[PDB]
Amino acid sequence: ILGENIKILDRSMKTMMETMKLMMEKVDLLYAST
Amino acid sequence: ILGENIKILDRSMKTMMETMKLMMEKVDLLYAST
Amino acid sequence: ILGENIKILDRSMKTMMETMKLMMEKVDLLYASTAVGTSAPMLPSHPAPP
Amino acid sequence: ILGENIKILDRSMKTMMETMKLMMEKVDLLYAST
Amino acid sequence: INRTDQSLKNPLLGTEVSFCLKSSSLPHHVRALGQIKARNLASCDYYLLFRQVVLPPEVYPIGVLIRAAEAILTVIVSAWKLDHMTKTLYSSVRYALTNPRVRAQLELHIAYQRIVGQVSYSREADIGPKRLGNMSLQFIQSLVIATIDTTSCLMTYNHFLAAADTAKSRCHLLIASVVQGALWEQGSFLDHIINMIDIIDSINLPHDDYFTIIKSIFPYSQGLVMGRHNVSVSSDFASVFAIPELCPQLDSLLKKLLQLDPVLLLMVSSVQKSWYFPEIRMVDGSREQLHKMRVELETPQALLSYGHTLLSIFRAEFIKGYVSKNAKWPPVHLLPGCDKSIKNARELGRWSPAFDRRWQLFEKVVILRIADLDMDPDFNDIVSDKAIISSRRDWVFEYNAAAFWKKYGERLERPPARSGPSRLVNALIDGRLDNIPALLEPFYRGAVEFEDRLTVLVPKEKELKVKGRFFSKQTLAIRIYQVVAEAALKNEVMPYLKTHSMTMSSTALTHLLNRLSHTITKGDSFVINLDYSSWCNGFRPELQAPICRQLDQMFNCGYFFRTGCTLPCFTTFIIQDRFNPPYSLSGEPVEDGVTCAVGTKTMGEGMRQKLWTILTSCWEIIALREINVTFNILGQGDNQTIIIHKSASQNNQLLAERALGALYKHARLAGHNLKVEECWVSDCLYEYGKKLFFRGVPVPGCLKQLSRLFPNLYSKLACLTSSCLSAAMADTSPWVALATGVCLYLIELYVELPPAIIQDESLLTTLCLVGPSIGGLPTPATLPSVFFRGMSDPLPFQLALLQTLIKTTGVTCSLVNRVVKLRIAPYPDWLSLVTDPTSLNIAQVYRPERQIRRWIEEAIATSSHSSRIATFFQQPLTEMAQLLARDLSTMMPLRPRDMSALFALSNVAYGLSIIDLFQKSSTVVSASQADVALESVRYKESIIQGLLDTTEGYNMQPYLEGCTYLAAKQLRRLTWGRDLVGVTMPFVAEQFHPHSSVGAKAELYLDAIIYCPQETLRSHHLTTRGDQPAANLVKDTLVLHQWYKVRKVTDPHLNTLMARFLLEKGYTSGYVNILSTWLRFSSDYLHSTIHFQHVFTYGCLYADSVIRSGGVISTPYLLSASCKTCFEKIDSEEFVLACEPQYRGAEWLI
Ligand SMILES: [Zn+2]
């Protein structure tokens, strides 16, 4: 029953790809602010 | 237990999931000051 | 060799933990510094006890 | 018959590590330049 | 009830006075302003007025006191058989009480005490004029009017209490000084004390300068002693202080004292409370406090970097200790780039020495979980008296409504009553502290509830700082958080800090102190004494955040330490100036920088005491290690002593200079700027535990310690006896302490009792010689522990004292019966015996309250509304304790010394201890009361009536004729009817009889203990050393069982009781030592444990006495055995419990 366990982990990782780039611009434009 | 040590790893990641989110809100409201 | 490939994941996790903690230290102190003399709320910095 | 589906996340893990460090210096140097 | 306090216990505040002078419109103001003269002094200058008080000479007839003291000391000495020093002692006492200045001071003290007594706990609020010599006091509410001839000073009751306490302390100082001088090699130094008193009273400098001088007297004296008697290291401590500029006369007097004897200078200069206390400049003081809590000496980035370094060293020390205690590294995770040496050491589970100087390598080591946070504090900490604020909404209750109305022009929206308790014990009773894990849950998350983020700073009383120092009372939640964090730090991590661990193990502590004392004089171990002043208002969040994080990860309590590591920045701080309230905008304080301050960088004094200790130890270790010098950090508070050992490469001067420079540099990188006056190096003087040490030998605190519920005669006398006992335990001579205590006890009796009792010399003597052991007021006379260190039976000593009194003086036995008034209890009270093995079964009439245990327990059981308390008191603890005591009272060879031992290791003992903690909280007893004002009046009346009686208690003729040992055993037989055995300890004085061997006869040579002196002793030899020689209740029970089995004590009933004790737990299966190092022992004994040590102490005390009496020893002296019946043979047959045990068990405790 590991296959399902892997897939749920894989999607959670995919939740790290978009979330970071959804805040990479947010945090880096702070530098543009300063 | 071979699969438990990875099961505990999951929720350990889940802590990060929001641990940033609560940082996201505080940083975001920090902008509203400026 | 089914577990050794897993331990390196744990060490990878623990390495990130220190990364996160350093982020928290820095961000926490920035927010705290600006909170002196103001009514800024005390936002949580850890989800909850299990 | 399953190890093949786990080597692809660790290789991605490194790719996600390099980004983490790549932004570590960025965030740290921002604090000092203050 | 008005004017409750009978002694100075609060800071001297003036804002009330200023408010009443100009503001306020209450009725009392009309009366007060009416009785103020034109030359109205300010409250800040009250001491300038009380100095002028003069009493008419010899107003109180205290000659009876003099004669009584003479007789009492003569009797004590004669009982001790040291007849060659009674002359000295009673002559000294008579001289002390006959001196003009001393008598005047004593009379002033008596007048002050009577005036205080006549107004404290008075339902009346406008007590009329009271005459005090040339002053005319006048009381109004909590304000006092003092007038001499034409000048007046509107004061607060606290100011008058301060003046009274100053007079009392001066009386103590003078009496002790005369007595001490009479027993020194160098003659009376009372003249210097009087001269200092006159000089200081002659100081007319402004408030601030005068109190700066008074504060500096002691450190300047240390500097003076230091700059003269340093051999290796230099010293410039004396240079910083300005005493020689402001008050040249005082400087000359101090230098003269130094010339006479440095020990005497440190002796007298240590007094700091015998001089009027300052009135805190609350405006400036509070402004400075708030500013100091928000200043940034160092840039936060540098502070964070140094915090990382401190984290590295903390990791290193913790790992070293863990390895040393378990031979294996704790669970750690090695970061990438970790050094190879670290990997190898972790793999082998050892600690390479190279790490000690390479702490930086540990920056890559992370310690994972090693324990769990103990979110369940024991009652020892919860049950306390530390005032706390229930929540924010109670802040309006720390101010006066009238002051707020006048200062701002708006009412104060004070609710009808405080919404919550006022003290920790009340909170526990109310049930607030029953779900602590939920209470601390916000801390775990990191968001302390807004309602729990307010702190009230309070000024500290009896401090000679005009600006004042504040300690903080805090909300219940923050208080419990602090308690839990402190317990965790002190129990789980601190013991593992190798370098810091060797400062709490008394064995290592004592060994280190002894080594330091032995090596200081040799000039190979000098000491650096750092005394941080801004330590409390020091640490910033940045410095401690890394260690806070490491602790959080170490205990798996997410962000539990970091939350309090950064909390101050979100906290509201206010100053309890009851008449300087802050503005209230929306029911919350408004920041103004003087009264209120919302958000600061530190939580103030008291908080994070242990963590700050860890950080200080860390950076000190860093500073010392990098210069490669042996060190032994020794200290717990803001003052720490650094012991540095000599290095064969460089002299102590260069080593000290380098160490001081390193300490400066490293304390600099902590926001803890260290100035010159806070640090000094010395090889002659050092301090530990508030106790000086000159050239190794301690400096006695005779002149300082002896100058130190509802009130009662018994309570005052008990406090006096405890203070004198502590002084005796210190390096103070037993004779000095005893004579001073006798004088003070007579003074205390004079203050209270009416003339009929006082002018009854025989009665007064008998009262002073009747100790609590036989039933009576505590007295310094009846105290065997004064001259000894171990446990001792006081009963034989008391009987010996009474016997000697009867034989020597004119007191008749009938009078002793009249005073003793023995009253055997109608039925045995086994609990009292078990909790105090060496006491008779008699009615302790003079005790302030008896049987009150059930009153407190019953009060707690009801009116609680809690859960922890409910489960703690399911059935009466007192009744079960009585059951257990009765159960233990069935040992056919009844041996109370073990009944106490067995009873000690039972849950019921812990329960009684908790009840004792509860009653100790004055709030609980007052809550139990169901006022105290009448209670004291009734109490005073009963005692005053009791001894005025002429009734007899029990014919004592049969009990004051033979050996006090045999007599005491007979008395116990009578008062329990059980031939109690196993606890009576003979009296050394009657057991032996010292004899000098100059006139020794062959008849005296048969049996004795001989003392061989290497050379003739002299007074100088009395101050210089010579060359001659939780679950832990399970382990102690186990070692007790092993003790019994080794002795072959195997009894089925005892075994069952012991096993029950286990299963309810869960388990299932120095004063004379310096002379002592000057003589040699003698083991040539025929019959005779600890009691032998008492005999040795008495033997060397004989020599001490003969030396101090202007005598010398030429030949060894023997200790013959006088009373034979005072010797016995003990078998300790067995603990036959007879009737089967019925205690069962509690299982609720722990
Ligand atoms: Zn005897």
PDB file of N, CA and C in Angstrom, chain E residues 774-846:
ATOM      1  N   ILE E 774      11.173  22.280  77.332  1.00  0.00           N
ATOM      2  CA  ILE E 774      10.327  21.999  78.482  1.00  0.00           C
ATOM      3  C   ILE E 774       9.007  22.745  78.416  1.00  0.00           C
ATOM      4  N   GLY E 775       8.810  23.586  77.406  1.00  0.00           N
ATOM      5  CA  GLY E 775       7.589  24.353  77.264  1.00  0.00           C
ATOM      6  C   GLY E 775       7.784  25.780  77.723  1.00  0.00           C
ATOM      7  N   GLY E 776       7.983  26.694  76.784  1.00  0.00           N
ATOM      8  CA  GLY E 776       8.277  28.066  77.142  1.00  0.00           C
ATOM      9  C   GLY E 776       8.696  28.859  75.925  1.00  0.00           C
ATOM     10  N   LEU E 777       8.873  30.155  76.147  1.00  0.00           N
ATOM     11  CA  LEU E 777       9.233  31.045  75.057  1.00  0.00           C
ATOM     12  C   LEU E 777      10.613  30.673  74.519  1.00  0.00           C
ATOM     13  N   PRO E 778      10.829  30.753  73.207  1.00  0.00           N
ATOM     14  CA  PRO E 778      12.173  30.498  72.681  1.00  0.00           C
ATOM     15  C   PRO E 778      13.178  31.459  73.291  1.00  0.00           C
ATOM     16  N   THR E 779      14.358  30.940  73.607  1.00  0.00           N
ATOM     17  CA  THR E 779      15.398  31.726  74.247  1.00  0.00           C
ATOM     18  C   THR E 779      16.738  31.378  73.622  1.00  0.00           C
ATOM     19  N   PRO E 780      17.660  32.337  73.542  1.00  0.00           N
ATOM     20  CA  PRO E 780      19.018  31.995  73.105  1.00  0.00           C
ATOM     21  C   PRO E 780      19.772  31.159  74.115  1.00  0.00           C
ATOM     22  N   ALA E 781      19.370  31.185  75.384  1.00  0.00           N
ATOM     23  CA  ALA E 781      20.069  30.405  76.397  1.00  0.00           C
ATOM     24  C   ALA E 781      20.002  28.918  76.079  1.00  0.00           C
ATOM     25  N   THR E 782      18.797  28.357  76.079  1.00  0.00           N
ATOM     26  CA  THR E 782      18.605  26.926  75.858  1.00  0.00           C
ATOM     27  C   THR E 782      18.779  26.637  74.374  1.00  0.00           C
ATOM     28  N   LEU E 783      20.028  26.455  73.959  1.00  0.00           N
ATOM     29  CA  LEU E 783      20.335  26.095  72.581  1.00  0.00           C
ATOM     30  C   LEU E 783      21.655  25.339  72.507  1.00  0.00           C
ATOM     31  N   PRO E 784      21.645  24.012  72.636  1.00  0.00           N
ATOM     32  CA  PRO E 784      22.902  23.267  72.474  1.00  0.00           C
ATOM     33  C   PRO E 784      23.509  23.420  71.095  1.00  0.00           C
ATOM     34  N   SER E 785      22.687  23.647  70.071  1.00  0.00           N
ATOM     35  CA  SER E 785      23.190  23.743  68.709  1.00  0.00           C
ATOM     36  C   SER E 785      24.098  24.944  68.499  1.00  0.00           C
ATOM     37  N   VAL E 786      24.123  25.894  69.434  1.00  0.00           N
ATOM     38  CA  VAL E 786      24.975  27.066  69.269  1.00  0.00           C
ATOM     39  C   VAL E 786      26.430  26.645  69.132  1.00  0.00           C
ATOM     40  N   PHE E 787      26.878  25.732  69.987  1.00  0.00           N
ATOM     41  CA  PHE E 787      28.275  25.331  70.025  1.00  0.00           C
ATOM     42  C   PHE E 787      28.569  24.088  69.200  1.00  0.00           C
ATOM     43  N   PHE E 788      27.552  23.430  68.656  1.00  0.00           N
ATOM     44  CA  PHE E 788      27.723  22.171  67.951  1.00  0.00           C
ATOM     45  C   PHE E 788      27.110  22.265  66.562  1.00  0.00           C
ATOM     46  N   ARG E 789      27.336  21.222  65.773  1.00  0.00           N
ATOM     47  CA  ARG E 789      26.868  21.168  64.394  1.00  0.00           C
ATOM     48  C   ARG E 789      25.846  20.073  64.149  1.00  0.00           C
ATOM     49  N   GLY E 790      25.946  18.947  64.854  1.00  0.00           N
ATOM     50  CA  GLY E 790      25.038  17.841  64.648  1.00  0.00           C
ATOM     51  C   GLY E 790      23.804  17.917  65.529  1.00  0.00           C
ATOM     52  N   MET E 791      22.916  16.951  65.316  1.00  0.00           N
ATOM     53  CA  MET E 791      21.728  16.815  66.146  1.00  0.00           C
ATOM     54  C   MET E 791      22.113  16.572  67.600  1.00  0.00           C
ATOM     55  N   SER E 792      21.344  17.159  68.514  1.00  0.00           N
ATOM     56  CA  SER E 792      21.602  17.006  69.938  1.00  0.00           C
ATOM     57  C   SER E 792      20.293  17.120  70.701  1.00  0.00           C
ATOM     58  N   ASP E 793      20.171  16.344  71.769  1.00  0.00           N
ATOM     59  CA  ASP E 793      18.987  16.408  72.612  1.00  0.00           C
ATOM     60  C   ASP E 793      19.041  17.670  73.464  1.00  0.00           C
ATOM     61  N   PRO E 794      18.067  18.577  73.355  1.00  0.00           N
ATOM     62  CA  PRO E 794      18.110  19.787  74.184  1.00  0.00           C
ATOM     63  C   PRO E 794      17.598  19.590  75.596  1.00  0.00           C
ATOM     64  N   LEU E 795      16.837  18.533  75.864  1.00  0.00           N
ATOM     65  CA  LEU E 795      16.231  18.392  77.186  1.00  0.00           C
ATOM     66  C   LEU E 795      17.265  18.299  78.297  1.00  0.00           C
ATOM     67  N   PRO E 796      18.291  17.449  78.216  1.00  0.00           N
ATOM     68  CA  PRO E 796      19.258  17.401  79.324  1.00  0.00           C
ATOM     69  C   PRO E 796      19.914  18.740  79.581  1.00  0.00           C
ATOM     70  N   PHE E 797      20.176  19.507  78.525  1.00  0.00           N
ATOM     71  CA  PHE E 797      20.768  20.827  78.700  1.00  0.00           C
ATOM     72  C   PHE E 797      19.836  21.745  79.475  1.00  0.00           C
ATOM     73  N   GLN E 798      18.540  21.703  79.166  1.00  0.00           N
ATOM     74  CA  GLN E 798      17.583  22.556  79.862  1.00  0.00           C
ATOM     75  C   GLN E 798      17.528  22.212  81.343  1.00  0.00           C
ATOM     76  N   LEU E 799      17.467  20.918  81.653  1.00  0.00           N
ATOM     77  CA  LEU E 799      17.435  20.496  83.045  1.00  0.00           C
ATOM     78  C   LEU E 799      18.721  20.887  83.756  1.00  0.00           C
ATOM     79  N   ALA E 800      19.857  20.770  83.069  1.00  0.00           N
ATOM     80  CA  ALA E 800      21.119  21.188  83.665  1.00  0.00           C
ATOM     81  C   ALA E 800      21.115  22.679  83.964  1.00  0.00           C
ATOM     82  N   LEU E 801      20.589  23.486  83.043  1.00  0.00           N
ATOM     83  CA  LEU E 801      20.531  24.924  83.276  1.00  0.00           C
ATOM     84  C   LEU E 801      19.681  25.239  84.497  1.00  0.00           C
ATOM     85  N   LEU E 802      18.502  24.624  84.592  1.00  0.00           N
ATOM     86  CA  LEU E 802      17.649  24.887  85.747  1.00  0.00           C
ATOM     87  C   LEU E 802      18.321  24.437  87.036  1.00  0.00           C
ATOM     88  N   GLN E 803      18.975  23.278  87.006  1.00  0.00           N
ATOM     89  CA  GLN E 803      19.660  22.778  88.191  1.00  0.00           C
ATOM     90  C   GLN E 803      20.753  23.739  88.632  1.00  0.00           C
ATOM     91  N   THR E 804      21.545  24.227  87.678  1.00  0.00           N
ATOM     92  CA  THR E 804      22.605  25.167  88.012  1.00  0.00           C
ATOM     93  C   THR E 804      22.029  26.458  88.568  1.00  0.00           C
ATOM     94  N   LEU E 805      20.931  26.938  87.985  1.00  0.00           N
ATOM     95  CA  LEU E 805      20.277  28.125  88.521  1.00  0.00           C
ATOM     96  C   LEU E 805      19.903  27.915  89.980  1.00  0.00           C
ATOM     97  N   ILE E 806      19.214  26.811  90.267  1.00  0.00           N
ATOM     98  CA  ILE E 806      18.794  26.532  91.636  1.00  0.00           C
ATOM     99  C   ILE E 806      19.998  26.514  92.564  1.00  0.00           C
ATOM    100  N   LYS E 807      21.053  25.800  92.173  1.00  0.00           N
ATOM    101  CA  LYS E 807      22.201  25.664  93.061  1.00  0.00           C
ATOM    102  C   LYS E 807      22.883  27.004  93.302  1.00  0.00           C
ATOM    103  N   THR E 808      23.063  27.803  92.251  1.00  0.00           N
ATOM    104  CA  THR E 808      23.881  29.004  92.370  1.00  0.00           C
ATOM    105  C   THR E 808      23.089  30.176  92.938  1.00  0.00           C
ATOM    106  N   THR E 809      22.050  30.615  92.233  1.00  0.00           N
ATOM    107  CA  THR E 809      21.393  31.858  92.598  1.00  0.00           C
ATOM    108  C   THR E 809      20.327  31.617  93.665  1.00  0.00           C
ATOM    109  N   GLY E 810      19.656  32.693  94.061  1.00  0.00           N
ATOM    110  CA  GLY E 810      18.640  32.633  95.088  1.00  0.00           C
ATOM    111  C   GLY E 810      17.291  32.145  94.628  1.00  0.00           C
ATOM    112  N   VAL E 811      17.143  31.837  93.339  1.00  0.00           N
ATOM    113  CA  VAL E 811      15.878  31.317  92.841  1.00  0.00           C
ATOM    114  C   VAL E 811      15.571  29.999  93.529  1.00  0.00           C
ATOM    115  N   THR E 812      14.345  29.866  94.018  1.00  0.00           N
ATOM    116  CA  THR E 812      13.905  28.642  94.666  1.00  0.00           C
ATOM    117  C   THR E 812      13.160  27.753  93.677  1.00  0.00           C
ATOM    118  N   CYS E 813      13.134  26.456  93.987  1.00  0.00           N
ATOM    119  CA  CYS E 813      12.529  25.493  93.075  1.00  0.00           C
ATOM    120  C   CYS E 813      11.062  25.814  92.828  1.00  0.00           C
ATOM    121  N   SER E 814      10.352  26.261  93.864  1.00  0.00           N
ATOM    122  CA  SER E 814       8.947  26.610  93.692  1.00  0.00           C
ATOM    123  C   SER E 814       8.775  27.653  92.599  1.00  0.00           C
ATOM    124  N   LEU E 815       9.711  28.597  92.501  1.00  0.00           N
ATOM    125  CA  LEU E 815       9.637  29.584  91.431  1.00  0.00           C
ATOM    126  C   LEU E 815       9.810  28.929  90.069  1.00  0.00           C
ATOM    127  N   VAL E 816      10.724  27.964  89.962  1.00  0.00           N
ATOM    128  CA  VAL E 816      10.904  27.260  88.696  1.00  0.00           C
ATOM    129  C   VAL E 816       9.614  26.557  88.303  1.00  0.00           C
ATOM    130  N   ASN E 817       8.979  25.885  89.262  1.00  0.00           N
ATOM    131  CA  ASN E 817       7.682  25.279  88.990  1.00  0.00           C
ATOM    132  C   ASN E 817       6.684  26.326  88.521  1.00  0.00           C
ATOM    133  N   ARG E 818       6.649  27.472  89.199  1.00  0.00           N
ATOM    134  CA  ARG E 818       5.728  28.538  88.825  1.00  0.00           C
ATOM    135  C   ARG E 818       5.924  28.946  87.373  1.00  0.00           C
ATOM    136  N   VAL E 819       7.177  29.104  86.957  1.00  0.00           N
ATOM    137  CA  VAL E 819       7.454  29.578  85.607  1.00  0.00           C
ATOM    138  C   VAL E 819       7.294  28.453  84.596  1.00  0.00           C
ATOM    139  N   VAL E 820       7.888  27.293  84.873  1.00  0.00           N
ATOM    140  CA  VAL E 820       7.798  26.178  83.935  1.00  0.00           C
ATOM    141  C   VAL E 820       6.345  25.764  83.752  1.00  0.00           C
ATOM    142  N   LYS E 821       5.629  25.586  84.857  1.00  0.00           N
ATOM    143  CA  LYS E 821       4.206  25.269  84.838  1.00  0.00           C
ATOM    144  C   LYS E 821       3.931  24.090  83.907  1.00  0.00           C
ATOM    145  N   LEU E 822       4.527  22.955  84.257  1.00  0.00           N
ATOM    146  CA  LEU E 822       4.405  21.760  83.437  1.00  0.00           C
ATOM    147  C   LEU E 822       2.958  21.287  83.397  1.00  0.00           C
ATOM    148  N   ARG E 823       2.504  20.896  82.207  1.00  0.00           N
ATOM    149  CA  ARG E 823       1.139  20.407  82.008  1.00  0.00           C
ATOM    150  C   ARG E 823       1.195  19.250  81.017  1.00  0.00           C
ATOM    151  N   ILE E 824       1.273  18.027  81.537  1.00  0.00           N
ATOM    152  CA  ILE E 824       1.286  16.853  80.678  1.00  0.00           C
ATOM    153  C   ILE E 824      -0.032  16.763  79.925  1.00  0.00           C
ATOM    154  N   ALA E 825       0.043  16.402  78.652  1.00  0.00           N
ATOM    155  CA  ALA E 825      -1.168  16.285  77.860  1.00  0.00           C
ATOM    156  C   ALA E 825      -2.022  15.137  78.391  1.00  0.00           C
ATOM    157  N   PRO E 826      -3.348  15.260  78.343  1.00  0.00           N
ATOM    158  CA  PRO E 826      -4.192  14.183  78.880  1.00  0.00           C
ATOM    159  C   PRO E 826      -3.990  12.856  78.177  1.00  0.00           C
ATOM    160  N   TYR E 827      -3.731  12.870  76.875  1.00  0.00           N
ATOM    161  CA  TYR E 827      -3.545  11.661  76.090  1.00  0.00           C
ATOM    162  C   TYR E 827      -2.335  11.832  75.188  1.00  0.00           C
ATOM    163  N   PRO E 828      -1.643  10.745  74.854  1.00  0.00           N
ATOM    164  CA  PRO E 828      -0.471  10.867  73.982  1.00  0.00           C
ATOM    165  C   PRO E 828      -0.837  11.490  72.645  1.00  0.00           C
ATOM    166  N   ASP E 829       0.066  12.317  72.129  1.00  0.00           N
ATOM    167  CA  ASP E 829      -0.072  12.945  70.817  1.00  0.00           C
ATOM    168  C   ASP E 829       1.099  12.450  69.977  1.00  0.00           C
ATOM    169  N   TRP E 830       0.913  11.307  69.322  1.00  0.00           N
ATOM    170  CA  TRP E 830       2.037  10.653  68.667  1.00  0.00           C
ATOM    171  C   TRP E 830       2.527  11.431  67.456  1.00  0.00           C
ATOM    172  N   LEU E 831       1.656  12.201  66.807  1.00  0.00           N
ATOM    173  CA  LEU E 831       2.082  12.929  65.617  1.00  0.00           C
ATOM    174  C   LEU E 831       3.159  13.948  65.964  1.00  0.00           C
ATOM    175  N   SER E 832       2.977  14.670  67.071  1.00  0.00           N
ATOM    176  CA  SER E 832       3.969  15.662  67.469  1.00  0.00           C
ATOM    177  C   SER E 832       5.312  15.005  67.752  1.00  0.00           C
ATOM    178  N   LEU E 833       5.301  13.870  68.449  1.00  0.00           N
ATOM    179  CA  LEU E 833       6.547  13.164  68.721  1.00  0.00           C
ATOM    180  C   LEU E 833       7.211  12.717  67.430  1.00  0.00           C
ATOM    181  N   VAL E 834       6.425  12.176  66.501  1.00  0.00           N
ATOM    182  CA  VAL E 834       6.989  11.670  65.256  1.00  0.00           C
ATOM    183  C   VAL E 834       7.611  12.801  64.453  1.00  0.00           C
ATOM    184  N   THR E 835       6.963  13.961  64.429  1.00  0.00           N
ATOM    185  CA  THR E 835       7.507  15.092  63.690  1.00  0.00           C
ATOM    186  C   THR E 835       8.559  15.862  64.477  1.00  0.00           C
ATOM    187  N   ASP E 836       8.821  15.488  65.729  1.00  0.00           N
ATOM    188  CA  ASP E 836       9.848  16.145  66.537  1.00  0.00           C
ATOM    189  C   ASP E 836      10.253  15.193  67.651  1.00  0.00           C
ATOM    190  N   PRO E 837      11.221  14.312  67.396  1.00  0.00           N
ATOM    191  CA  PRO E 837      11.446  13.188  68.319  1.00  0.00           C
ATOM    192  C   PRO E 837      11.797  13.596  69.737  1.00  0.00           C
ATOM    193  N   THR E 838      12.438  14.745  69.933  1.00  0.00           N
ATOM    194  CA  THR E 838      13.039  15.093  71.218  1.00  0.00           C
ATOM    195  C   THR E 838      12.178  16.051  72.025  1.00  0.00           C
ATOM    196  N   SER E 839      10.857  15.899  71.995  1.00  0.00           N
ATOM    197  CA  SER E 839       9.957  16.792  72.706  1.00  0.00           C
ATOM    198  C   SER E 839       9.086  16.014  73.679  1.00  0.00           C
ATOM    199  N   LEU E 840       8.773  16.656  74.797  1.00  0.00           N
ATOM    200  CA  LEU E 840       7.886  16.078  75.788  1.00  0.00           C
ATOM    201  C   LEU E 840       6.435  16.241  75.352  1.00  0.00           C
ATOM    202  N   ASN E 841       5.563  15.428  75.946  1.00  0.00           N
ATOM    203  CA  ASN E 841       4.131  15.488  75.656  1.00  0.00           C
ATOM    204  C   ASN E 841       3.488  16.468  76.631  1.00  0.00           C
ATOM    205  N   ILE E 842       3.639  17.757  76.326  1.00  0.00           N
ATOM    206  CA  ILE E 842       3.195  18.830  77.204  1.00  0.00           C
ATOM    207  C   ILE E 842       2.427  19.860  76.389  1.00  0.00           C
ATOM    208  N   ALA E 843       1.660  20.686  77.096  1.00  0.00           N
ATOM    209  CA  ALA E 843       0.848  21.719  76.463  1.00  0.00           C
ATOM    210  C   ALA E 843       1.715  22.942  76.196  1.00  0.00           C
ATOM    211  N   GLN E 844       1.922  23.260  74.919  1.00  0.00           N
ATOM    212  CA  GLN E 844       2.725  24.416  74.523  1.00  0.00           C
ATOM    213  C   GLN E 844       1.822  25.645  74.521  1.00  0.00           C
ATOM    214  N   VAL E 845       1.553  26.152  75.723  1.00  0.00           N
ATOM    215  CA  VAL E 845       0.601  27.248  75.868  1.00  0.00           C
ATOM    216  C   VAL E 845       1.067  28.472  75.092  1.00  0.00           C
ATOM    217  N   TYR E 846       2.357  28.793  75.173  1.00  0.00           N
ATOM    218  CA  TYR E 846       2.864  30.000  74.535  1.00  0.00           C
ATOM    219  C   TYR E 846       2.902  29.897  73.019  1.00  0.00           C
TER     220      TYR E 846
END
